[PDB]
Design a protein around this ligand. Structure first.
Ligand SMILES: Nc1ncnc2c1ncn2[C@@H]1O[C@H](COP(=O)(O)OP(=O)(O)OP(O)(O)=S)[C@@H](O)[C@H]1O
Ligand SMILES: Nc1ncnc2c1ncn2[C@@H]1O[C@H](COP(=O)(O)OP(=O)(O)OP(O)(O)=S)[C@@H](O)[C@H]1O
Ligand SMILES: Nc1ncnc2c1ncn2[C@@H]1O[C@H](COP(=O)(O)OP(=O)(O)OP(O)(O)=S)[C@@H](O)[C@H]1O
Ligand SMILES: Nc1ncnc2c1ncn2[C@@H]1O[C@H](COP(=O)(O)OP(=O)(O)O)[C@@H](O)[C@H]1O
Ligand SMILES: [Mg+2]
Ligand SMILES: [Mg+2]
Ligand SMILES: [Mg+2]
Lengths: 327, 319, 277, 347, 330, 298
């Protein structure tokens, strides 16, 4: 029945040895488990880094078959108010351990969605029952956590997934699905991933679905770019060359031809040209300022709708009028 | 598993002589503990500087063997409503427990900032009528969250941020009782990453010794990161745009910090930024808020942060 | 505008109990009620203007005295009266006759806001105790009166069903059928069904589905008919059927439902119609 | 009676302004079965509501002008027990949810979801009921998001003819599902002809027919305004339009003109406080701030003592502060900012 | 019968045109049972609601549709409480057993689909309660989020959902559907038509079908039996004629403020929407070869600012006058 | 279907179901269906668990055609069955006939009620089973610290008094003396203060009290068994003690308490075996037990 699951949930790490990327955190929590003392943990990082998998695998290693009766997993799908904090968490922490001779674990996922009233009442619950229960807090926005709750929990930062970890997980996925990935397509997948394994799996599944014969054909860069609808690395430099080297009559034609050959979106081209221009050696310090302050406004206006052609010409104008400073 | 408590709870001070920091306040608390007459007090300060372990130790020393039936600790985890104030606190105040002369019952209302208004207004009468037998010890993080009539009857004790030597002394005591190998630079890094928080110093030290054993700068900085407000300050106080964009990207975007967190910390850093003209500071506040609105509306991208930094540099160079 | 009537509950029990059947229903539905005193007939109205409307016809022969004169057409004057006070007075008379008495009700229109002088007598045991009451009412205008008209119901090829009388063998069974859905607390919509004869109470929701059935005999005097109704209207239907022997049920396909009640006084027959949208 | 509502055309053949818009409405009414959702946009006073009524008359026959008014009750989350009048009639329904306030979602999610789920099966043609949403541009962008799917899913039994002016604050999904019908304002010749029809019907004695032309140019393509002006002038002159009859104007227009004169003449902080007092007086009369800003701008641009630079600065500040007011909560800040910027730029 | 937009709505996945990168994946899903959580985003009128409502049909069948599908749009309450109770209880519900006919005809996947249409109108607090609902019951239920602005979906929700971008339907990839609908309704059109309807309606087949229906309803009203030309289409679309926009341009060239203000006052009386005249001016100024690089570089930003201000729901007269006056000073 | 069960004793099923109402009445109830019978396992906050036992002899019919699986687990909302089975079985001439059935996974739980002329039918769609182990909240069979048998009426009166006096916290005493004296009291911490409800040592109320050494075999005299239980969980057995004749109390050294309600219609069926397992509080305080002991001394 696990083969009828999405690839994001099908390839969830069941053990702590299947969590890639985060090494200084896994190798610390494993020593915490082996020593026998597990402090109050806080897991922080971008989405899709492996926090909710790491904590569940850690608790599975700690408790084994007693996971169900020794773990209280509460998330944003539950009414984690002050009444729940005082009426469920408190009596789960107060009651004695069920046969494990150790501590209980209370996992508060998406704790950034908890109110300040429910977060200022958990502090003394954490402090009082530290002997027989422990608290793990998972969040991606640390500005919604109260400073005292941030002080009571040991902080572990889940960095964005490096290229090597993403490629080693991609190898396992390819082995399990009997798929093939071109060397030029793995780099594109890693670049579009932005440190998220969920994006890796959700793109690879659609790439497998795109292939006519998933047992003989290979997922090239064309397959990835067509499935995810992203501009090619050549279509992101041809448009920039037209904007920065041609006139105002052919740059528009090149842009509208690139946006019509494969139906590319304006925002993807904007965010690709921004990355391309970030490597430029602009020697005015005002060209960069103008480019950023204008392309950010165009990006903000795109998110609210409006005329597409007007914004497409505005990108050309903002890139052209900025390099006039450099020259 | 094991019964080994975390060092935050294993090394919680049980006497007033082990609480480091605020020497002028701890000495006064010891004087109160010896003399006996304890006035109503409000202890406030930053988190983790020793505000709870001070009141608990003071109550323990002041009451001796009568601690079980002489104190009433009501925290935010308990229903501190108006009914509880009118019934449980009233009945504890009306209790006639006989104590050594000078000693008084102590109502340790920890986290009193979260208490409602009607409960505090009933507490007004509670400390007004029953003041000869019981005494109230409010512990908070912000003194303005307790109503003015309640603050009038109390003595305000303002705990301060702990220095780099008191925390070092307590850390050395812990390392001496736990046989931990260390190096001076590692301990200095622990103090630097603690930011005057003893709890977050003990936690970082425990994590470092569990993960690597030896407390050096590398083993510390590879498990606990430098404080992100001090990196946001470095990013916001740069000279060129290509030197602030580098600190933004390689130290806040590839490390895993959310854009909304960066903006929220930038606002706080700008509020406390020094050697900056007030017009520049207010313009920076406006530009940070304009990006905060965009991020809250959905566009939380690195390009928006780059534009915010570019506008900050624009207002810096001439405006 | 002179209005005066005399009621005797002990003299005629049927017309009197139908008056009890009309007053209880207009009390249970909503506050205030409309009373049009036509020169030959009375009609007690509770117009919420989705919520249902009741139209009960009360003849002029039910009361001992029906003197009604007004300057409007057919001596029609229309009252708006708070139902709680008249219900209390009526319950007082019920207790008066329960303790043992045979006195009559003298109801006079004594003075646009007016009141009814509902006065009667009670004897405890050979003592004279006079019960005087004054229920404040308002005078509806003729232009306001013509704005209220009885809802129309048609059955081009629809289906009315003859509900078995409650005095028969199947009357208690059908009453239990109607009240079975009333036992559930978390019910707000009931889906009636019509097959030609079976009727079923169906309540389908996200996670649970009632489907109560009537397996007894049914009659339809002389195609699918389903409607979604509220539970409170079904309670009102239960109360109306409990006090009526002749009950007529007609179901329209996704348009409306009508609960028709009739008492054969023969003489003009008193009828109660509950229009349900 | 009011001459606006006593000479209103009640048919598609009685509507004499634009022959091109009548010939398109007749084409729409030729086959009412496949009538799409309609969005009528144009200048105020053109007669978009009258043309909607004429289209409904041509589709559903006569009887669309007998309007019955019933008040429906809606309850919010906080149990505020809000209120809304629902003008209705046979074959069609009329709602101005924007009047309810920011809680227009609670009426477009109840009335528009209860009349779209009725199927209107009478005694067998289900047909459709036309719902007219007056002031479709005043919705709070949440009434439209709960309306797009509502009118897309239930289009079989309901049709929506939304009437609005300047359909900028209408979201793109709503305009995508609606056929946009432009209603241009009549020229001065058509307005003069209509006023001639009224004056010969009402038998008032006019002299120098040019007066009707003057009313047409003063109304600025507004039939309602022109008819009200004509009635006021005839009543104040005792049914005799003399050549020197004063063209009466709305009082708030004169007050805005006086405000413009004060701004042009006096440019100081105390004059700015007096301008705030005038603005508060105007705001106390439920005059929309966007209309006040538009009138202030287009009356300051008519001053003959201002050069091109000052007028360009005025229009730039007008656009900036209009955009600021569109995305704000308190309009007094934006109005004061615009007035202060104009005062600073003039001197 | 019915409006042409609803009459010609796709019923199966073989009539959704020009979206060949997101329909092929969903059709490959028909054979397997590993449908991921879907995030459908794109321009309005691109076929997202016509794609999900067809994929659901192909997956389940009409009889299983009422039991294995829950649809929540913006027209009903979708607060934090609703997400926490109704959606969670539907996700916790066991998969209904298909009938023999359903199994023998339809693939009948062992999961249900929760469609959240117009998810961009959902608060960020209610969106946070779905993050664990789509992951704990991912093997019993599936989620499909439909929106027009992907930025209004929170990043944690966008990470768990596979993103399918629906391309804009221009005159190159959506011409076949319009030509099929026109032939099915016996609409006689000139050459050039059905390529101008798809250009006036920028990336919106719904508007391109409604405009064709409107143009046909007048052609069958005149009764002359003539072919619809390229001027009538603009006449019922709202496009400003090339003789009034030319007057606008040649009045802009003479930078007199008063004459421009008077002509704009006359123009706004005709009822033209500013969002169309700004677009036409953008085309005229960008495509012209009589203007230098600096003029176009400034006109692009001017038109962008005007369009952004008009998108927020501002007065068209003030913004149009400001734009034209600014152009006259370039 | 795969399982079918019918009965007429709706009062017994209603009483069994009303014992699950103290645990919320607005959540999920998990049902086991095997050859022995059908049960309702209900747990709250992983600190207390109640389990019914309706034997197959209780119903007149019990088929259980499920040959493939030993038991069937289904999860439904509890309030609806509570509202349904409350027919009170009036009009004794025509007894309302119950009919419980469950065709399997995907099928809804059916409650057909027959009133001779009326055949109503309620379908309960089952929910996905939560990943929780009912074996966790279970007591040892080798580590019993004490075992006591108490009559239902005295225990019910004790819990009623504790509820009336508030009883925010409760304690349990179990001390056996060498002179055959057995003491059992429910000491409580309430608004009043320190209150003790000592059960009588007579065999009519305390049938058998045996205190062990954690081995369930040794009989040590002069030792005391202390159980600190939150009265929020301890009050859940009050409604179960209102229908019981004898109650069995067993606790181990790991702080779990098993309240075994013995309820004493067909002749073959034994009754409703209601088992309420409860977890002990940690009791970080150490002088509280000393004060309990001193209060029991005098
Ligand atoms: N280090 C990793 N190694 C392997 N798979 C990973 C890793 N990190 C994430 N994944 C995959 O991404 C899926 C989602 O990650 P989760 O850990 O469940 O959520 P998360 O990473 O904590 O992000 P948030 O903050 O909860 S939105 C997992 O089920 C895995 O399939
Ligand atoms: N001055 C101090 N001397 C010794 N240990 C200290 C000191 N301040 C804090 N600690 C340590 O901090 C932990 C206890 O923190 P608390 O004193 O409860 O915090 P607090 O200052 O009351 O802050 P809040 O209000 O509870 S967030 C133990 O690990 C103590 O050893
Ligand atoms: N690819 C397509 N093929 C055929 N018809 C299409 C296509 N895309 C859109 N349409 C038509 O566009 C009209 C509306 O389609 P929908 O999918 O309901 O709208 P939409 O894509 O959801 O846009 P919204 O609702 O504003 S987000 C229908 O008449 C469809 O037939
Ligand atoms: N063709 C016409 N002939 C005469 N009067 C007209 C015509 N069209 C509109 N009117 C006048 O316009 C008035 C109503 O305008 P209204 O519908 O409110 O305009 P809008 O819909 O733009 O607000 C009516 O009083 C009517 O007299
Ligand atoms: Mg997670
Ligand atoms: Mg503390
Ligand atoms: Mg849609």
């Amino acid at each position: 029945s696990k083969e009828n699951l999405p690839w994001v949930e099908k390839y969830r790490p069941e053990t702590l040895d299947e969590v890639y990327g985060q090494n200084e955190v896994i190798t610390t929590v494993r020593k915490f488990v082996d020593e026998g003392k597990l402090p109050h943990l806080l897991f922080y990082g971008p989405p899709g880094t492996g926090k909710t998998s790491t904590i569940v695998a850690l608790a599975r290693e700690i408790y084994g078959k007693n996971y169900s009766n020794m773990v209280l997993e509460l998330n944003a799908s539950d009414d984690r108010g002050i009444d729940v904090v005082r009426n469920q968490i408190k009596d789960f922490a107060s009651t004695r351990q069920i046969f494990s001779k150790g501590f209980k674990l209370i996992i508060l996922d998406e704790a950034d969605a908890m109110t300040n009233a429910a977060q200022n009442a958990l502090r003394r619950v954490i402090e009082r029952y530290t002997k027989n229960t422990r608290f793990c807090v998972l969040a991606n926005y640390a500005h919604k956590l109260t400073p005292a709750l941030l002080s009571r929990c040991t902080r572990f930062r889940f960095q964005p997934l490096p290229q090597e970890a993403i490629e080693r997980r991609i190898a396992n996925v390819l082995v399990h699905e009997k798929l093939k990935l071109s060397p030029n397509a793995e780099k594109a997948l890693i670049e579009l991933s932005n440190g998220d394994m969920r994006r890796v799996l959700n793109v690879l599944q659609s790439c497998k679905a795109t292939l006519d014969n998933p047992d003989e054909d290979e997922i090239s860069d064309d397959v990835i770019y067509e499935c995810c609808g992203a501009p090619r690395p050549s279509d992101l430099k041809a448009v920039l060359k037209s904007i920065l080297e041609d006139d105002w009559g052919t740059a528009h034609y090149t842009l509208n031809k690139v946006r019509s050959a494969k139906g590319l979106a304006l925002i993807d081209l904007i965010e690709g040209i921004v990355k391309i221009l970030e490597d430029y050696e602009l020697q005015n310090e005002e060209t960069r300022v103008h480019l950023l302050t204008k392309l950010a406004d165009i990006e903000y206006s795109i998110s609210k709708g409006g005329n597409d052609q007007i914004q497409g010409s505005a990108v050309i104008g903002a890139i052209k009028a900025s390099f006039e400073n450099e020259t | 598993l094991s019964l080994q408590l975390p060092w935050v709870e294993k090394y919680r001070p049980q006497v007033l002589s082990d609480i480091v920091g605020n020497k002028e306040t701890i000495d006064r608390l010891q004087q109160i503990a010896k003399d006996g007459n304890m006035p109503h007090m409000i202890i406030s300060g930053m988190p983790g500087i020793g505000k709870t372990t001070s009141v608990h130790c003071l109550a323990h020393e002041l009451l001796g063997r009568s601690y079980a039936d002489g104190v009433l600790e009501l925290n935010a985890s308990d229903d501190r409503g108006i009914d509880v104030v009118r019934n449980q606190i009233k009945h504890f105040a009306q209790k006639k427990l006989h104590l050594p002369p000078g000693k008084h019952k102590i109502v340790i209302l920890d986290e009193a900032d979260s208490m409602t208004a009607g409960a505090q207004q009933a507490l007004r009468r509670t400390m007004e009528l029953y003041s000869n037998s019981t005494r109230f010890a409010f512990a908070c993080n912000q003194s303005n969250k307790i109503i003015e009539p309640l603050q009038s009857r109390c003595a305000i004790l303002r705990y301060s941020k702990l220095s780099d030597e008191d925390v070092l002394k307590r850390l050395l005591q812990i390392i001496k009782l736990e046989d931990v190998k260390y190096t001076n630079d590692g301990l200095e890094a622990i103090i630097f990453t603690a930011e005057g928080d003893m709890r977050q110093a003990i936690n970082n030290l425990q994590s470092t010794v569990a993960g690597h054993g030896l407390v050096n700068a590398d083993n510390v900085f590879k498990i606990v990161d430098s404080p992100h407000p001090l990196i946001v300050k470095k990013m916001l106080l740069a000279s060129n745009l290509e030197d602030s964009i580098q600190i933004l990207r390689t130290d806040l975007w590839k490390k895993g910090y959310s854009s909304i967190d960066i903006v929220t910390t930038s606002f706080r850093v700008t509020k406390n930024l020094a050697q900056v003209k007030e017009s520049v500071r207010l313009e920076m506040i406006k530009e940070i808020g304009l990006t905060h609105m965009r991020i809250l509306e959905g566009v939380g991208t690195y390009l928006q942060l780059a534009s915010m930094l570019a506008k900050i540099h624009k207002l810096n160079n001439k405006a | 505008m002179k209005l005066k009537l005399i009621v005797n509950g002990c003299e005629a029990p049927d017309d009197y109990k139908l008056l009890r059947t009309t007053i209880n229903t207009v009390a249970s539905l909503r506050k205030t009620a409309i009373l049009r005193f036509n020169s030959e007939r009375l009609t007690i109205i509770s117009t919420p203007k989705d919520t249902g409307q009741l139209w009960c016809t009360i003849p002029h022969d039910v009361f001992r005295l029906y003197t009604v004169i007004s300057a409007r057409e057919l001596n029609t004057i229309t009252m708006e009266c708070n139902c709680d006070s008249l219900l209390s007075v009526f319950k007082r008379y019920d207790r008066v006759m329960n303790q043992g008495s045979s006195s009559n009700m003298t109801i006079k229109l004594q003075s646009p806001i007016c009141a009814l002088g509902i006065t009667f007598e009670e004897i405890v045991h050979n003592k004279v105790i006079m019960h005087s009451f004054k229920v404040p009412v308002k005078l509806l205008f003729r232009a306001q009166d013509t704005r209220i008209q009885e809802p129309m119901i048609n059955y081009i090829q629809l289906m009315m069903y003859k509900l078995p009388p409650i005095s028969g063998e199947f009357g208690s069974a059908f009453h239990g059928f109607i009240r079975r859905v009333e036992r559930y607390s978390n019910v707000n919509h009931i889906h009636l069904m019509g097959v030609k004869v079976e009727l079923k109470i169906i309540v389908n929701e996200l996670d649970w589905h009632l489907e109560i059935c009537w397996n007894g005999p049914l009659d339809s005097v002389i195609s699918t008919h389903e409607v979604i109704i509220r539970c409170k209207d079904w309670k009102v239907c239960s109360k109306l059927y409990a006090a009526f022997e002749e009950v007529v049920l007609a179901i329209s396909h996704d348009e409306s439902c009508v609960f028709h009640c009739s008492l054969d006084r023969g003489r003009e027959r008193g009828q109660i119609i509950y229009y349900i949208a | 009676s009011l001459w606006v509502d006593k000479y209103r055309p009640k048919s598609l053949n009685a509507l004499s302004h634009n022959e091109e818009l009548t010939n398109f409405l007749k084409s729409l009414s030729d086959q009412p079965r496949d009538l799409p959702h309609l969005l009528l946009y144009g200048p105020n006073g053109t007669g978009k509501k009258t043309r909607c009524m004429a289209l409904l008359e041509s589709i559903f026959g006569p009887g669309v002008y007998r309007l019955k008014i019933d008040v429906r009750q809606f309850v919010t989350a906080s149990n505020r027990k809000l209120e809304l009048n629902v003008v209705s009639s046979p074959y069609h329904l009329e709602i101005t949810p924007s009047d309810m306030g920011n809680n227009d979602r609670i009426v477009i999610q109840e009335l528009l979801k209860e009349v779209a789920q009725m199927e209107q099966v009478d005694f067998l043609a289900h047909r459709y009921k036309c719902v007219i949403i007056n002031e479709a541009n005043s919705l709070t962008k949440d009434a439209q998001a709960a309306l797009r799917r509502t009118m897309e899913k239930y289009s079989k039994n309901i049709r929506l003819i939304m009437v609005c002016d300047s359909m900028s604050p209408i979201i793109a999904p709503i305009k995508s599902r609606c056929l946009l019908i432009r209603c241009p304002a009549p020229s001065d010749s058509e307005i003069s002809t209509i006023l001639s029809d009224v004056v010969t019907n009402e038998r008032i004695q006019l002299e120098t027919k040019d007066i009707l032309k003057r009313i047409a140019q003063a109304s600025n393509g507004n039939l309602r305004v022109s008819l009200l002006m004509l009635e006021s002038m005839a009543l104040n002159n005792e049914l005799a339009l003399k050549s020197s009859s004063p063209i009466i104007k709305p009082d708030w227009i004169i007050v805005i003109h006086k405000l413009t004169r004060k701004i042009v003449k006096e440019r100081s902080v105390n004059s700015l406080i007096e301008c705030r007092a005038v603005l508060y007086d105007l705001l106390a009369h439920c005059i929309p701030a966007n209309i006040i800003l538009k009138e202030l701008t287009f009356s300051l641009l008519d001053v003959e003592t201002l050069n091109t630079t000052n007028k360009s600065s005025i229009i730039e500040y007008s656009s900036v502060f209009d955009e600021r007011l569109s995305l704000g909560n308190k309009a007094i800040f934006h109005l004061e900012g615009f007035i202060a910027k104009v005062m600073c730029c003039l001197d | 019968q019915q409006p042409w937009v609803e009459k010609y709505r796709p019923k199966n996945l073989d009539e959704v045109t020009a979206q060949d990168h997101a329909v092929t994946v969903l059709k490959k899903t028909l054979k397997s049972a590993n449908l991921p959580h879907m995030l459908f985003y794109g321009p309005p009128g691109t076929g997202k609601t016509s794609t999900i409502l067809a994929l659901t049909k192909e997956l389940y069948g009409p009889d299983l549709m009422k039991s294995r599908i829950l649809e929540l749009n913006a027209s009903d309450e979708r607060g934090i409480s609703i997400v926490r109770e109704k959606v969670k209880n539907f996700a916790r519900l066991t998969v209904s057993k298909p009938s023999k006919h359903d199994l023998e005809n339809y693939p009948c996947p062992p999961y249900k689909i929760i469609i959240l249409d117009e998810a961009d109108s959902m608060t960020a607090d209610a969106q946070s309660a779905l993050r664990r609902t789509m992951e704990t019951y991912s093997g019993v239920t599936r989620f499909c989020l439909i929106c027009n602005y992907v930025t209004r979906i929170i990043d944690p929700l966008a990470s768990r959902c596979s993103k399918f971008r629906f391309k804009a339907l221009d005159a190159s990839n959506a011409i076949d559907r319009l030509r099929f609908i026109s032939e099915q309704e016996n609409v006689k059109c000139d050459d050039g038509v059905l390529e101008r309807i798809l250009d006036i309606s920028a990336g919106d087949l719904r508007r391109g079908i409604t405009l064709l229906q409107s143009a046909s309803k007048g052609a069958q009203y005149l009764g002359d039996g003539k072919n619809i030309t390229s001027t009538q289409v603009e006449e019922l679309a709202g496009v400003v004629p090339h003789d009034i926009l030319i007057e606008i341009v040649e009045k802009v060239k003479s930078g007199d403020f008063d004459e421009i203000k008077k002509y704009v006052n006359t123009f706004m009386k005709s009822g033209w929407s500013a969002a169309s005249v700004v677009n036409q001016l953008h085309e005229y100024y960008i495509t012209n070869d009589n203007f230098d690089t600096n003029f176009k570089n400034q006109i692009s930003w001017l038109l962008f600012t005007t369009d952004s201000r008009l998108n927020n729901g501002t007065n068209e007269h003030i913004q149009l006058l400001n734009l034209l006056v600014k152009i006259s000073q370039l | 279907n795969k399982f079918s069960a019918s009965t007429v004793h709706l009062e017994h099923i209603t009483t069994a179901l009303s014992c699950l109402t103290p645990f919320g009445s607005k959540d999920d109830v998990l049902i086991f269906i095997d050859a022995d019978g059908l049960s309702f396992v209900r747990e709250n906050n992983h600190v207390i668990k109640i389990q019914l036992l309706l034997s197959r002899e209780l119903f007149m019919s019990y088929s259980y055609r499920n040959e493939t699986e030993d038991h069937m687990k289904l999860c439904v909302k509890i309030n609806h069955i509570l509202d349904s089975v409350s027919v009170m079985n009036r009009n004794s001439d025509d007894i309302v006939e119950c009919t419980l059935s469950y065709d399997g996974h995907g099928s809804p739980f059916v409650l057909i009620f027959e009133d001779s002329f009326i055949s109503e039918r309620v379908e309960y769609s089952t929910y996905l089973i939560k990943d929780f182990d009912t074996n966790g909240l279970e007591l040892d069979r080798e580590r019993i610290s004490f075992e006591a048998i108490i009559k239902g009426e005295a225990l019910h009166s004790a819990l009623k008094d504790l509820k009336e006096i508030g009883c925010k916290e409760c304690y349990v005493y179990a001390k056996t003396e060498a002179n055959d004296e057995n003491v059992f009291a429910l000491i409580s911490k309430s608004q009043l203060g320190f209150s003790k409800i000592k059960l009588p040592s007579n065999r009519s109320i305390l049938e058998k009290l045996q205190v062990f050494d954690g081995d369930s075999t040794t009989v040590i005299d002069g030792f005391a068994v202390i159980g600190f239980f939150d009265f929020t969980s301890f009050d859940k057995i009050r409604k179960s003690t209102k229908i019981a004749s004898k109650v069995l109390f067993r606790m181990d050294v790991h702080g779990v308490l098993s309240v075994n309600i013995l309820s004493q219609l067909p002749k073959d069926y034994p009754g409703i075996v209601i088992e309420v397992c409860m977890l002990e509080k940690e009791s970080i305080d150490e002088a509280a037990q000393t004060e309990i002991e001193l209060l029991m001394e005098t």
